[PDB]
Each structure stands twice: as structure tokens, then as C-alpha cells.
């Protein structure tokens, strides 16, 4: 009955400010302390601060004192940290969670990106085998997702039909655009006679793209 | 300002041994000391409370135990699904600190890619682009070459490659390459190469394609 609901991802412009809402559910916000921690991407986690709902206490580690601010609503029972001041080291995922009486329980996560780099939706280019390409008892289709910002995107094969044998690749970042790529393998009896479409969000520019895969036409 | 140094931060390990992280107070911390696992893509979840209280919920494989400057994450049977980055905490003193981390990988027998190779799509040549991807699935050991060979010419510049995490559920790594150019040059040019080179073969594993025959 106890989970905590973070707010949706935020892409800001160097300089900018942003506030994330931790709403909670299951526990009143008074009786814990909630906690927020920064996660840099392949790094580890950093405690930001700690807040008392209750009085509205708050204790930053020196690195966070004024890039952190965090208020609390118990009326709400929502926690918010709001960042401001931000520059690209600020780009991370961020966590709320409650402790009391050495107990956890974490959030989602929201994740900030911060960049001058304007928003681009990605290209979606289906990777059909090769024309002359082998055929075995698996084959394997490929999709491409090239020149987007910022991160995230993600990939589904036939709606979530061909899970089993899909590796979704991380993205590169070149020229300030990500590109990855998504591979599924199907046994040959599955394509081209049933249909493989390949599925591609970028929440961040309202993108969803379907991309079937069609066999090579010469 | 009590500091958590945690070791190692790879863990390179066989199912069915015993993994056992180590995190160092720099100064005392007793009681308030606990251990984390965070899954990719998920938020890190609590399995020690009081650096020897298991919270619930959680295989007795996983155990804790140390005071004052010395503490020890113990997984006594390592598992597939036990793949995952570990972190300890310090709660004693207010500047709370994490520890730098331990990423768990699974020892298993080499296991050879599966190379795929796939021309530009049709879409992206009249953007003015072609990226030629090749995929190697399904290896062991992580560390691997590729190598993009253009009508017998290697070819090292516009090369992005792209290293899944382990899955879990066979301990193995896939990998993705991505050879971007021009289209005029790949217009011009015919045959496209990728080779793998792996620990499993002296060998390369090579897929190729030909340009003047769709």
C-alpha cells in the first residue's frame, strides 16, 4: 500500500530551474523522513538532503546547498525537490524515499537533462536482412533509431508480441544526438509470413513511430 | 563526512560461489550501515537494515555483518538474478554517504556471437545517410573486436559500438556496430564487412553484403 509517485522526466536549458513532486501513498509524510538521492548516468548514488515534513527541517550535503531546495506538503503528503541554478553536471536521475526507523522505500525516479541542444525527434529506419542474406531456423531483424535528444527512447517489437529474443541496444551520443539500435530474432517460419513492426517512443518529443519490417524490395 | 569506501567495483564471479563486499567507514558507524540492490533501470532496494537485518522478502543467500569501521555484504550462493549494482550507506552521521558500488558479473563458458549484418535502409538513403549496422549477439567473454572492412579496405572512422548489459537469464553480452557514411560513398563502393574477433576463435566471424545486386 506504500508507494511513492515521482513526477515525469524534465529536459532544461543551462541556467533554468525544475521541480520534481514525490507523492506518496500508504503513509503519512510527517512520521518519516523523506530523503532525495542524485544518480549521474553509469555512476553511483549521491545523497542530496534529507527534509522533516513535520517541522520542515532540512539537512543538504555541502555540494547540494544551493543547487537543492526541498520542500514538503503534508497536506499534499508530497515531497518536492526543486533544482535550480542547473548546469550539465546536474544532468542525473533522481530519487525521493522515506526512512524511519532505519526503513527504505524508494520512487521511481525522475530523470533531468540538462543541454543547450534543442530537442529532436528520432529516425526510425527498419533493418531488413540482406536480400541474398542466409536462411536458417531463426532470423534476425534489426531497427534503427538514429539522431534523436535527449534520452530516453524505447523500443517494443509487435506491441510486446516478440519479447523472448530482443536485445535493445544503449544509445551513443555523437554530435550532441543519440543513436542505438534494437535487434529481435524470430524462428524463419515467423517472417516475412507473420508481420514484425518495430515500435518507437521519444516521450520527449511526443514521438511514437511504427516501423514495420519489410523484406528487401530490389 | 564519514566516507564509505566500497570494494571491489567489479566483482567478477561463478554461480554457486560466494561474493562478499567489503565497505569501510572512515570512521565509526556501528549500528547504521545498509546495503542496497539496484537492478538496471530500476530504483535501488533495500536488503539490509542495520547492517546484519535482512528487511524481508529477501533470499537468505544475502547476508551482512560488521561494526564500527569494518562492514560485509555476503551473497553465500551466487545466482543469476543477484545481477545487479550493490551499494552501501551510511545513516550515523547526517552528511550521508553511499559507497562507490560493486557490479556483479557472472562467470560462464566462452560462447561464440551470432553476427548479423544489415545494409542501409531504403528510407535513410534518401535522407543522404547510410549507416551500415552489424549485431553480435549471445557472447562470452564482454571483450570483443569488430572490424569493418569496405571492398577489402578496413575502414575505422564513423564506427559506433554499443555493448548490452549481461542477461540474466543466460550471462551473456550482445553487442552493437554502427559504420556511418556519406551516401555517395556508400554508392560508390560495393562490398560492406563486418568480422568479429573473439576469444572463442583465432578466426574472424564474418558477414558481408553487396551493394549491386538489390
Known amino acids: 500500500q506504500v508507494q511513492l509517485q515521482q513526477s515525469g522526466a524534465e529536459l532544461v536549458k543551462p541556467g533554468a530551474s525544475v521541480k520534481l513532486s514525490c507523492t506518496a501513498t500508504?503513509?503519512?509524510?510527517?512520521?518519516?523522513?523523506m530523503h532525495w538521492v542524485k544518480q549521474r548516468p553509469e555512476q553511483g548514488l549521491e545523497w542530496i538532503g534529507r527534509?522533516?515534513?513535520?517541522?520542515?527541517?532540512?539537512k543538504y550535503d555541502p555540494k547540494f546547498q544551493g543547487k537543492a531546495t526541498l520542500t514538503a506538503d503534508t497536506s499534499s503528503n508530497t515531497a518536492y525537490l526543486q533544482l535550480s541554478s542547473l548546469t550539465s553536471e546536474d544532468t542525473a536521475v533522481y530519487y525521493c524515499?522515506?526512512?524511519?526507523?532505519?526503513?527504505?522505500?524508494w520512487g521511481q525516479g525522475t530523470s533531468v537533462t540538462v543541454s543547450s541542444a534543442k530537442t529532436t525527434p528520432p529516425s526510425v529506419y527498419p533493418l531488413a536482412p540482406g536480400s541474398g542474406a542466409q536462411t536458417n531456423s531463426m532470423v534476425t531483424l534489426g531497427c534503427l533509431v538514429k539522431g534523436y535528444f535527449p534520452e530516453p527512447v524505447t523500443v517494443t517489437w509487435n506491441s510486446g508480441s516478440l519479447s523472448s529474443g530482443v536485445h535493445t541496444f544503449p544509445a551513443v551520443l555523437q554530435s550532441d544526438l543519440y543513436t542505438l539500435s534494437s535487434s529481435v530474432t524470430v524462428p524463419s517460419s515467423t517472417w516475412p509470413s507473420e508481420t514484425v513492426t518495430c515500435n518507437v517512443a521519444h516521450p520527449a518529443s511526443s514521438t511514437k513511430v511504427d516501423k514495420k519490417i519489410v523484406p528487401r524490395d530490389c | 563526512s564519514i566516507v564509505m569506501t566500497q570494494t571491489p567495483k567489479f566483482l567478477l564471479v561463478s554461480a554457486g560461489e560466494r561474493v562478499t563486499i567489503t565497505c569501510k567507514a572512515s570512521?565509526?558507524?556501528?549500528?547504521?550501515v545498509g546495503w542496497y540492490q539496484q537492478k538496471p533501470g530500476q530504483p535501488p532496494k533495500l536488503l539490509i537494515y542495520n547492517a546484519s537485518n535482512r528487511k524481508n522478502g529477501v533470499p537468505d543467500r544475502f547476508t551482512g555483518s560488521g561494526y564500527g569501521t569494518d562492514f560485509t555484504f555476503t551473497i553465500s550462493t551466487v545466482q543469476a538474478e543477484d545481477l545487479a549494482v550493490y551499494f552501501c550507506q551510511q545513516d550515523h552521521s547526517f552528511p550521508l554517504k553511499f559507497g562507490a558500488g560493486t557490479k556483479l558479473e557472472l562467470k560462464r563458458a566462452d560462447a561464440a556471437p551470432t553476427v548479423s549484418i544489415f545494409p542501409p535502409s531504403s528510407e535513410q538513403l534518401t535522407s543522404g545517410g547510410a549507416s551500415v549496422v552489424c549485431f553480435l549477439n549471445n557472447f562470452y567473454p564482454k571483450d570483443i573486436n569488430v572490424k569493418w572492412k569496405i571492398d577489402g579496405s578496413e575502414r575505422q572512422n564513423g564506427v559506433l559500438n554499443s555493448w548490452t548489459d549481461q542477461d540474466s537469464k543466460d550471462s551473456t553480452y550482445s553487442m552493437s556496430s554502427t559504420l556511418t557514411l556519406t551516401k555517395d560513398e556508400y554508392e560508390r563502393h560495393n562490398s560492406y564487412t563486418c568480422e568479429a574477433t573473439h576469444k572463442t576463435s583465432t578466426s574472424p566471424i564474418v558477414k558481408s553484403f553487396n551493394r549491386n545486386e538489390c
Open positions: 570512521q565509526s558507524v556501528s549500528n547504521d
Open positions: 524515499a522515506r526512512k524511519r526507523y532505519s526503513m527504505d522505500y
Open positions: 527534509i522533516d515534513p513535520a517541522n520542515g527541517n532540512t
Open positions: 500508504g503513509f503519512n509524510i510527517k512520521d518519516t523522513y
